[PDB]
Amino acid sequence: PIETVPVKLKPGMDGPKVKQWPLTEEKIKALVEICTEMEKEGKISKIGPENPYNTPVFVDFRELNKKTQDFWEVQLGIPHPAGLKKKKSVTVLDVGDAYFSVPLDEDFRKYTAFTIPSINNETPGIRYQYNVLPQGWKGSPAIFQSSMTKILEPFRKQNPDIVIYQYMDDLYVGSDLEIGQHRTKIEELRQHLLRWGLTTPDKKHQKEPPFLWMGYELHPDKWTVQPIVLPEKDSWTVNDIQKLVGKLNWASQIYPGIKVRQLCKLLRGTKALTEVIPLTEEAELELAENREILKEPVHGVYYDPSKDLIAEIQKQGQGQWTYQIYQEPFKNLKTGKYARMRGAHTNDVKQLTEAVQKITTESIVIWGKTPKFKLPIQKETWETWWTEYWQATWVPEWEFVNTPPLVKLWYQLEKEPIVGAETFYVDGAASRETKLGKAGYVTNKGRQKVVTLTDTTNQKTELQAIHLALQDSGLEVNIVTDSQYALGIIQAQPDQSESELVNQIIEQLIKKEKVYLAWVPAHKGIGGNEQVDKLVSAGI
Amino acid sequence: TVPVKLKPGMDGPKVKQWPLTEEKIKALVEICTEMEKEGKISKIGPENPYNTPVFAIKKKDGTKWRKLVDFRELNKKTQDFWEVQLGIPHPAGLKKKKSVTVLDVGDAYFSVPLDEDFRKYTAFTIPSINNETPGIRYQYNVLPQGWKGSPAIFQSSMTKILEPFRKQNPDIVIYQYMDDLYVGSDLEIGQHRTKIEELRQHLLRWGLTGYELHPDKWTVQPIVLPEKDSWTVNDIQKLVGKLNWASQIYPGIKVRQLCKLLRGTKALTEVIPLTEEAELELAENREILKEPVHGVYYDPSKDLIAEIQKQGQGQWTYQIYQEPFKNLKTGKYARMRGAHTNDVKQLTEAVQKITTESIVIWGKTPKFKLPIQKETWETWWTEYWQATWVPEWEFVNTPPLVKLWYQLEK
RNA sequence: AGGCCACAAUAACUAUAGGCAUA
DNA sequence: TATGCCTATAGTTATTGTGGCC
Ligand SMILES: O=C1Nc2ccc(Cl)cc2[C@@](C#CC2CC2)(C(F)(F)F)O1
Numbered sequence: 001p002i003e004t005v006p007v008k009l010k011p012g013m014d015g016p017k018v019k020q021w022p023l024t025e026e027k028i029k030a031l032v033e034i035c036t037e038m039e040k041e042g043k044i045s046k047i048g049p050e051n052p053y054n055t056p057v058f059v060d061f062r063e064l065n066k067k068t069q070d071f072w073e074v075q076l077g078i079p080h081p082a083g084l085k086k087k088k089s090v091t092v093l094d095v096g097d098a099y100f101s102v103p104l105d106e107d108f109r110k111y112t113a114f115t116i117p118s119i120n121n122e123t124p125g126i127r128y129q130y131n132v133l134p135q136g137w138k139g140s141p142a143i144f145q146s147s148m149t150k151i152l153e154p155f156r157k158q159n160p161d162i163v164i165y166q167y168m169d170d171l172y173v174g175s176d177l178e179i180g181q182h183r184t185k186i187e188e189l190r191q192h193l194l195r196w197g198l199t200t201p202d203k204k205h206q207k208e209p210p211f212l213w214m215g216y217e218l219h220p221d222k223w224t225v226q227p228i229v230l231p232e233k234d235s236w237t238v239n240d241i242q243k244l245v246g247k248l249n250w251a252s253q254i255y256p257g258i259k260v261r262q263l264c265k266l267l268r269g270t271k272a273l274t275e276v277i278p279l280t281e282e283a284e285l286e287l288a289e290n291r292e293i294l295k296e297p298v299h300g301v302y303y304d305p306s307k308d309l310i311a312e313i314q315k316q317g318q319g320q321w322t323y324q325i326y327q328e329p330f331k332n333l334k335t336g337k338y339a340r341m342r343g344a345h346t347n348d349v350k351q352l353t354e355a356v357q358k359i360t361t362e363s364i365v366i367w368g369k370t371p372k373f374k375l376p377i378q379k380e381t382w383e384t385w386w387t388e389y390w391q392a393t394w395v396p397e398w399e400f401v402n403t404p405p406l407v408k409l410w411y412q413l414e415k416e417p418i419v420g421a422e423t424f425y426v427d428g429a430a431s432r433e434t435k436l437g438k439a440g441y442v443t444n445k446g447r448q449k450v451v452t453l454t455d456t457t458n459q460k461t462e463l464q465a466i467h468l469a470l471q472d473s474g475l476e477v478n479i480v481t482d483s484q485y486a487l488g489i490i491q492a493q494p495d496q497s498e499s500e501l502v503n504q505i506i507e508q509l510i511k512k513e514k515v516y517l518a519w520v521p522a523h524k525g526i527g528g529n530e531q532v533d534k535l536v537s538a539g540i
Numbered sequence: 541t542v543p544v545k546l547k548p549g550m551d552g553p554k555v556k557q558w559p560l561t562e563e564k565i566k567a568l569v570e571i572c573t574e575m576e577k578e579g580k581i582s583k584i585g586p587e588n589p590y591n592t593p594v595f596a597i598k599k600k601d602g603t604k605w606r607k608l609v610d611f612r613e614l615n616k617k618t619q620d621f622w623e624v625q626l627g628i629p630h631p632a633g634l635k636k637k638k639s640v641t642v643l644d645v646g647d648a649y650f651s652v653p654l655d656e657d658f659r660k661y662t663a664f665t666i667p668s669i670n671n672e673t674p675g676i677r678y679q680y681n682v683l684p685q686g687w688k689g690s691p692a693i694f695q696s697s698m699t700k701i702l703e704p705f706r707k708q709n710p711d712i713v714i715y716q717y718m719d720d721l722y723v724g725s726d727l728e729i730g731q732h733r734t735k736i737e738e739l740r741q742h743l744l745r746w747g748l749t750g751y752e753l754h755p756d757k758w759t760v761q762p763i764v765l766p767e768k769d770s771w772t773v774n775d776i777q778k779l780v781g782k783l784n785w786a787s788q789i790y791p792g793i794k795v796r797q798l799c800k801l802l803r804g805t806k807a808l809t810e811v812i813p814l815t816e817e818a819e820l821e822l823a824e825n826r827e828i829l830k831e832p833v834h835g836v837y838y839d840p841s842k843d844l845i846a847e848i849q850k851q852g853q854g855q856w857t858y859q860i861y862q863e864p865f866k867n868l869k870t871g872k873y874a875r876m877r878g879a880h881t882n883d884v885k886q887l888t889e890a891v892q893k894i895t896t897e898s899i900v901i902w903g904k905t906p907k908f909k910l911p912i913q914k915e916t917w918e919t920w921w922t923e924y925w926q927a928t929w930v931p932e933w934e935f936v937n938t939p940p941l942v943k944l945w946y947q948l949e950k
Numbered sequence: 951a952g953g954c955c956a957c958a959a960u961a962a963c964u965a966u967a968g969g970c971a972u973a
Numbered sequence: 974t975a976t977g978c979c980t981a982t983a984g985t986t987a988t989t990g991t992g993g994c995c
């Protein structure tokens with residue numbers, strides 16, 4: 001009475017009518033012996049010229065799976081060992097007769113038909129069809145889990161003190177009871193599964209507490225990954241770097257200090273499978289220190305619902321952040337490596353907030369509650385940025401912690417114009433033909449300077465003009481520009497390699513005492529702005 | 541019972557479930573178990589590929605958790621049923637009233653059975669913490685809250701029960717949208733509360749079960765320009781930049797005489813006296829901002845758009861339009877007074893208030909343009925959300941010029 | 951006669967909204 | 974109206990890799 005699940009096909013196609021491959025005879029003699037045993041057990045049944053559908057046997061259901069209907073996800077996101085609870089005794093159960101115990105929908109059974117190769121030149125042959133769930137089928141793990149969940153329900157209600165997790169065929173059972181009480185309850189679970197015809201290993205055949213699951217070596221009190229050993233010195237190829245990044249990203253969940261950006265910069269190149277990309281001194285520098293991190297063995301800690309979650313942020317470099325989540329000090333649950341400056345530039349404060357937002361969402365999936373943050377930023381700086389910024393955000397609980405690399409807001413522009421300060425009207429113009437541009441400034445005192453540039457755009461020339469306006473000016477400066485682009489960048493705090501010019505302007509503004517910056521509409525006949533525009537667009 | 545079919549070509553809703561907190565999931569399990577025993581929803585297997593997002597909200601009167609299902613995706617695929625086949629009529633006299641009271645009648649749809657073949661499209665999944673359990677699956681057996689077809693089917697039974705109320709009060713206007721009921725009246729403060737209860741007591745006859753609006757008080761506040769005694773170059777330059785951008789909204793605005801005040805290079809502090817032409821241009825520009833602009837009309841064939849800007853210090857401004865620079869309704873939602881308010885809460889309170897105003901005047905939910913990140917909004921919006929509707933939103937960038945213009949609005 | 955799940959990197963298609971420049 | 978050059982918001986399909994599985 002294992003309750004069959006009704007399964008249909010996709011709207012506009014019948015089952016696979018694919019023919020068999022040439023006979024071998026070396027494999028046929030073995031296949032008959034296996035199929036007869038499956039027929040005797042009741043897994044498959046004989047059919048004649050009735051069934052038009054056919055499936056090739058190596059059984060490859062590649063054509064049928066495309067024709068079979070879509071099933072809802074079995075398990076999309078995999079459980080993280082940090083989200084699991086600490087248990088006294090743990091037991092795993094490898095289920096035999098998994099897909100064999102659960103029967104298939106009778107009407108669908110005709111689509112799973114397969115024909116055995118002949119003995120001597122296309123002789124009639126023997127035909128079979130699956131009465132139960134077949135291996136390598138789309139709906140096989142979906143129905144099996146759905147059937148298993150209904151079986152475990154009465155046991156879960158009777159035993160809420162114990163925790164049972166189901167994965168594919170294997171079952172993970174854990175409790176806080178003594179080793180004597182725990183061992184007895186597993187046998188009671190086995191007898192319940194044996195009712196439906198599910199074979200499970202006995203006490204002596206059961207695996208010991210070091211479980212290997214999804215690459216993780218699990219323990220009742222702690223968890224660790226399998227030792228990561230990588231090929232070393234000699235000049236490696238392009239995909240060997242991709243294999244190295246894959247191992248470092250895999251280690252980033254437990255090892256806190258991992259830097260992978262320089263290897264990602266080498267993979268920014270395209271094409272050849274054997275390019276043999278050499279290393280830069282800065283690339284091997286972060287690679288050599290990552291070897292030191294992977295030397296000493298580390299372990300993760302399980303989640304406790306009583307204690308609060310605490311996350312800490314550190315700025316390790318240019319567009320790189322590292323976080324470690326812990327309930328107890330020095331006892332880390334999970335680490336990360338967030339460095340997602342998406343090829344852009346951004347800043348320091350917003351980029352930190354983008355880091356916080358990723359962990360907040362991560363904690364909802366894993367633990368189910370929001371963690372308390374300890375950020376390397378003062379409340380004075382946080383309030384100043386988010387009041388002047390257009391984008392809204394909210395971090396409910398966060399505290400201040402002084403770390404060696406503090407997040408620092410460099411400069412702030414004046415809200416009102418400065419008295420006695422020299423006024424600088426500024427403008428830049430360029431043409432995309434030949435790529436020539438001019439940048440200049442005109443003051444109220446009379447002084448002016450115009451320069452010419454090579455390989456430049458309108459965005460670069462306007463940015464060069466303000467650089468000249470800060471180069472020749474005093475301490476208190478009033479700068480007027482007609483660009484929304486040039487105003488928008490300086491009003492933000494670009495903490496990146498936004499190319500040469502931007503880093504020079506930021507460095508200039510730190511040296512100055514007070515700077516006021518204003519915007520005017522272009523080509524409107526405004527005094528000051530009109531005089532500069534005629535000079536920069538003289539030959540353009 | 542009534543047969544329901546999808547729009548030809550399109551399949552059912554297949555949307556990913558957004559992760560929920562440990563407290564919210566346990567609250568949803570308690571509600572879903574109650575509804576399963578009542579015969580509202582039933583468990584279904586993995587053979588159903590269709591999915592609908594589910595969120596947990598909180599109420600004020602009930603004080604307990606409420607189940608919210610996001611049918612936004614499915615409603616786009618079943619739009620021919622509740623708009624063309626069974627459309628709800630909308631009057632143009634609801635927007636003019638003294639007092640409007642809103643009531644929730646969402647429990648009324650929990651009795652009328654749903655079509656057998658259409659039951660599979662209302663499937664939703666309850667997520668698990670760290671994916672320990674496979675995830676609990678359910679589908680609606682009756683008319684669900686948040687689905688546009690529910691008021692369309694009940695419409696034939698809704699008009700017959702409101703007939704004794706409509707015949708009693710001919711001058712009083714009533715309108716139904718989704719799970720909320722809108723009643724407008726020109727009666728007094730003490731009269732309004734009693735007449736609503738008369739309809740509320742009538743609901744109990746059929747068996748089913750500080751919030752008061754003033755649509756006449758939604759008068760559009762005009763944009764006022766700074767009244768200054770002495771003008772400087774910097775004061776003109778900020779004004780010209782804002783007015784030149786506003787020329788595409790209000791065509792009557794000109795900056796020609798104000799620009800002639802700036803002759804040659806001048807300091808920002810330099811005091812410029814206003815001439816006969818400059819004063820007369822600025823004064824007429826103030827008159828254009830006070831009087832409503834021509835060429836602004838509602839179009840039923842086009843979708844409505846709503847854009848909100850953050851001004852800071854607990855101030856938010858908004859615009860309702862169908863085409864850019866042509867606003868049908870403007871204003872500013874400052875803050876819900878004092879207590880506990882953040883950037884998300886003030887925005888959440890604004891969106892709900894703008895949506896409610898959109899239903900009274902037009903009867904359609906606008907496309908929301910929000911100055912917030914997608915990941916930030918989708919996590920915290922459920923905390924302060926109360927209404928059953930779900931407006932279609934997008935996340936965009938806020939220009940500096942549009943932010944500085946609408947803060948001059950009174 | 952490799953596919954599926956999680957994460958990451960590279961590439962490509964970007965789409966929408968606003969803006970500047972030239973035509 | 975087109976293309977090149979800027980900002981912001983949001984995605985999609987392919988490859989490769991790491992950890993796993995059928
Ligand atoms: O809540 C947890 N605690 C736990 C702790 C250690 C181990 Cl090794 C296993 C668990 C467990 C889980 C497991 C599935 C991930 C494999 C257990 F399956 F129930 F065992 O449940």
Ligand SMILES: [Ca+2]
Nearest residue numbers: 966967968969
């Ligand atoms: Ca454009």
Ligand SMILES: [Ca+2]
Nearest residue numbers: 954988989990
């Ligand atoms: Ca792969």
